[PDB]
Amino acid sequence: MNIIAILNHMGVYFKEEPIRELHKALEALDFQIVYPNDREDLLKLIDNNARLCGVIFDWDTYNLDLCEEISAMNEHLPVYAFANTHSTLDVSLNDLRLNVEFFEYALGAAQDIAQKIRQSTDAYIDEILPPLTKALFNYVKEGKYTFCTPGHMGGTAFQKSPVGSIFYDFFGANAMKSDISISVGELGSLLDHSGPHKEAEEYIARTFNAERSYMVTNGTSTANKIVGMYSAPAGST
């Protein structure tokens, strides 16, 4: 989630130079920059590449209807509009509903603008991730030492073995670090419907139009047996 599309290739130094400085500062912040040639190119780029996490364009060249077209494909995708001639009087209520952040052209402002864009990218990531998955990823980032199950202890045991190392290289570090148990209290408990798990369940029930929802980790075979045994006591038809 680190690709930033910069649309404009203008013909004035007072815009070109700040954009170049911003490109450098963003690349220092571990972003990959892409340069669509025109608006149709940008829209196709968005359509084909889900890792595109942001769009930079010049408000003078393109009106905010471009933001409408972008939002129709991804209403959460951050868009950064650089204002030169337009002012606060040039935005309507409908335009302000779009996820647009406004910047200005200035030499020496690339660092703070890049920091703002990094913050906005983190906000985008946070808003589209569901609660349990976000909590799991944050826990993995914390890098705690475990003396609890599972015994591989975040994949360390695999790394100590030749064949284990092959397995670890295949599945990757994150899959092993995320294999945890209820000894990690901050993630709550699936069986107890506690903490993030509870939020997850409610999230799921809202998305799937259910009053209540339960996640099952042994397939619809197990789901069927749960429903059936709750619903059909012995001796029933």
Added chain:
Amino acid sequence: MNIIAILNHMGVYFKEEPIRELHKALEALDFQIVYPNDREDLLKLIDNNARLCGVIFDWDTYNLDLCEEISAMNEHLPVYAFANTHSTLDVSLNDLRLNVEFFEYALGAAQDIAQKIRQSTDAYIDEILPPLTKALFNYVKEGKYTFCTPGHMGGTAFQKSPVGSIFYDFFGANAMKSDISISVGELGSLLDHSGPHKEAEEYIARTFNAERSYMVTNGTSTANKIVGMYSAPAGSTVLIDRNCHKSLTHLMMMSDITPIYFRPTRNAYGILGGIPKSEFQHDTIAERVAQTPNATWPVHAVVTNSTYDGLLYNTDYIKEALDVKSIHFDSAWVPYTNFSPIYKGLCGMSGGRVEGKVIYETQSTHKLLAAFSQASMIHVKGDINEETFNEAYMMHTSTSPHYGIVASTETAAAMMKGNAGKRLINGSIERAIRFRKEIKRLNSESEGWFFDVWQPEGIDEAKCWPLDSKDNWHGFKDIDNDHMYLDPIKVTLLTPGMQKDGSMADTGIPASIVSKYLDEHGIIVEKTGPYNMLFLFSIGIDKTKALSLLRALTDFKRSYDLNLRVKNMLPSLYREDPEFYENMRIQELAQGIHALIQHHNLPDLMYRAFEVLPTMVMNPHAAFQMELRGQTEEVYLEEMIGKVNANMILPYPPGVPLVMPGEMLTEESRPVLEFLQMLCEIGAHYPGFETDIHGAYRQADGRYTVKVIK
């Protein structure tokens, strides 16, 4: 200040090659070269980048009208014109008035020309810097060893310590090197008004239209105390704006002066209005004098101008009508009035000397100009003894002033000069007016509630809009005409919850909720009332911040209409009390607070409690003195009736002094108590929305006590 713009991209070697060599020589002299494509590009570059210290262009391609356009934005910016076909016969007198230096095209001349350009850049820097700041920077360049205060010795001590090194890295070397004392004799002394400091003072007095000016390093609170103690000896009577900052109350607790209060107005929102014209008349003052024990004709008067919410007085009428020999305008919120004609006649220093009177203006340079916190100014127009005044001045100033704060005061003055400073002030005013109009347009387009802005209908031109009796946008009853004006810089936004006639609606959104939401999304409001929010559109607000605020407001509206949960909408509020704010949505919290405000009838009680003045049994000095003697007792709120208050009671809302020390609540002043009691109740239902009453103290049992004279 090292950016040089080279405009031309020509087609002849005899010009191109010398310009390339000059580029190299300048870069050897530590300049950064930029290359605008055309003249409009160059003008935009100048407009947006204050570090652009010079422009190079080809006189053949561009006439000197380009220099006129450049000078209209910065008349000091050096411009270097390369002459080929034009001669001395091609320049006019008006052209020669511009800061243009002429060069020629030759191979091997780049080093000399670059040296000339370096000299001109140094001259530009020297000319725009004010004297004290220039002297301080030059001293820092000298790099002298100190065996004097401050003890950190130009930051060396910080570098010797781990945590000290973190602090030093944060603030930077120059900030520590410029922290010096009067042991450095070449900077002169603030207390003695010597050397550069003296020049600074005169500089400031010239820039701010004052006969005399004083730099203060402990804020306008200290500036007010200096002016007041010089103007009001013990046993005298002083006229005080009842909407006075607590610094004036502190002065009254210091000195045995008898106050008589100007009574300002207020509207249903709790926004303070102006003192009516009738309070400035001789007969009203005389009648109040005759009925106040140990009162004489006032020797000093203090008026808050502007109010916190941006209401300015017609000060010519006050200067003409107030029969007091000394008039002090506490102008903390309006240090910029001399730098735009829209404030003419609306500030203390406007106009000339008033016969037989001395006029003071106290200004918070740090509030609305660009200066470090605690930087303040005193401006004097009129005859003063000047030696007694210096005593009052030094008796409130530290002998070790922070030279950074002082230099920031002088630099705030320097930022106001010329075309660049005029552009600063005008740009801020126009930006504010654009934001106001946009709020009006968005409120018009909204289906359902939207934020309103406190202003008259159809603002068109940049000006201080008068408050007129026939219009009802301001909400003040029977206001005098041509008396109060709204400062466009101070933008007050209104949340729904109040009706036009002064009553409150069935639904509303208390402004504290919006302020908390804005804080969560990286936007800090100046202050919040029950249904109003104040935003300062200072010279530090640009287009980026204004558009960000608009987006934040529309985001709040959408989130509120989606009726989001407090746990998500306001994470810090939920963290305040996680049990209480579980499964509570934003609309329920807002409506609960709205209904609490409605059921207790907060606006009516707030208005009535500030309409009747509590009785003055004895001046605040005597009450404070016997508080110091331990002659006070803590009693409960329902027992203030008949008890002389020992402390100022200052409740938020409306954020202005309700009770002064030495004042007593009687039967006729019972609503005051009621209001306070109500505030207590209101604060006891929602964590994160607690009561705020200065001078009252919350007991462990949930009750409130006040200190009173035994």
Added chain:
Amino acid sequence: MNIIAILNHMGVYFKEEPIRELHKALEALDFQIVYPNDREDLLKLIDNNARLCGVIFDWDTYNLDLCEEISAMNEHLPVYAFANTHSTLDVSLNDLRLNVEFFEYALGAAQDIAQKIRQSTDAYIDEILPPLTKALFNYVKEGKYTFCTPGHMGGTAFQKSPVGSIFYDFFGANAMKSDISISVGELGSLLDHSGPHKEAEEYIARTFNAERSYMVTNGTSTANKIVGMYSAPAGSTVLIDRNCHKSLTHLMMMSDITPIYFRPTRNAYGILGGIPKSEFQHDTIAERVAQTPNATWPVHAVVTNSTYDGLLYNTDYIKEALDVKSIHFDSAWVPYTNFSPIYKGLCGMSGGRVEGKVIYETQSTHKLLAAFSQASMIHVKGDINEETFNEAYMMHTSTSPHYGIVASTETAAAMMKGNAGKRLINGSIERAIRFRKEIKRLNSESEGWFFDVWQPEGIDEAKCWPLDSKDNWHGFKDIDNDHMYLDPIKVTLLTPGMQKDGSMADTGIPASIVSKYLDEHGIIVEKTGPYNMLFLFSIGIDKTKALSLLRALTDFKRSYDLNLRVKNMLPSLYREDPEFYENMRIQELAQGIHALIQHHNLPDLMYRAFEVLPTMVMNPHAAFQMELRGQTEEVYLEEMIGKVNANMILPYPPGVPLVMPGEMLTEESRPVLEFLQMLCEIGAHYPGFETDIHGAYRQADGRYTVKVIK
């Protein structure tokens, strides 16, 4: 805080390769790697570089005694030990007390080890930073938009202006971003003692051995006024050290308090001594109370400890013997007394509670610790009414405090903690003692005159040296024993010109000439008397500066003995009145000034003028009030006899108040006037050596006037 030291060159690939990979990963995490050659090299690096935030070493090569050596310098510095042959069975409990993190050697493990090291570095930074400063830095990192004061809005306004941009570049972005107000609710409020501020206060109180502490942002002048106003109601009597800073006199002009003066001593140099023990006795105070009109038993006493020149009282005897409920030690010059055992019993906060009494210490954190100018502390030990004290505190503090000054106060406290802070204080004391001994050695091996140092004859170990009646180094007649001690930090150098018996010699070098020479050569003295110079050997003085000072002093001696010309030796003085100083040489100027001092008998007149107290006709408050009423007249110096003074007369030398407002010179106090008259005459002979008498005014014709009660 990003330097990591890697100590090894191990000769095995299975260690070297993982260390190289770790080097690369850490550099990707923005660390700077350094490579000491051996353990002694590493320890020197740690000693000389406070930005070293981590050490990596091989446990096989070096045992954990290396960690002990590191911890003795900085017990919080993270150390990372790479384990190969050692196991869990090879660590002891004492070893596990150290801040050591253990890693192992493996290919492909550089990334997670570097992440662990980054986390540990953040933990180190968090551990040593104090709470308010940490909160402020975190807020700045948040990068929020402000629509609140200060008006520059985190420095944006400066960037939009040319001169503003120069100011912004000088002070840096962080200084602007950290200039905030109480609109930022997450930082709490200084005036309300809320949030981080509260934590800061407690932190400070714990570090400085106080029950309660308060941060003051307008200097120890303001701190003194806060303490005095809380402690001395109107109509009360206060005991005042006659060697009081003029802030105490300002307080007396502000509040109607009757003073009775402790009488300190002085020596022939004009250096202030301590109050003799008999002045603290009940009988002497009672007699003075009986003789003073409108005087009662004192409720408050103020003692300067230490003096400007470094004389500390034995404060246990004062706390035991002074029968006054409140004792305030004005400790502006000694904020470091809690951080070295050599000051034990010599400061106000030393020891525990005094039964039935409250002890205050006012400290100038900016004077001798590392804090921005105007940063001051109040320390309280004893029972106080917290609410009334908070009122007195708010009465003198601005509502917009400079958060940088506040944070610097907290950071000075933090710099004083742990092994690193102890090394700071001990190193400063040792450095001062080494410099003193070197001055003695150089004076011994000088063939002719050389600078002397004001100290006992045989200083050996770091301690506050007692002043004893037998020794004559201090020059005080009949001094009490075990009463006064000399602070080694405050180094007073003596120029030739005074004999050991109190008379002056035939030849001398006035110290002003030496101070001017030192200023010309990049060295700023703290202050200068007639034949003494004061140098502060604070925690900001390093070996470089001390050696530079020694070189400058020897250069002055050589230049004086060569008898150079003033135009060359002292060019800036020559630039003052170039006509006067043409062909004038240094020895002639020095001898002329010395002979003017001798012929007028400056030491005897200075001594006698400060031995007789002028008559107190009215308290300073009454005299100042009458000056405010315009009831004073300017008369000539010769007519002072019989006239009540309206202003404090404070002459330099000796730099302490000579006449207080409300005091009157009688026949028995005629020498005072003579002294002042003398200071006028001597001041009118050499430009650049003018008279300096506060409260006197030089007229156009060259005479001096004073204001007196009409």
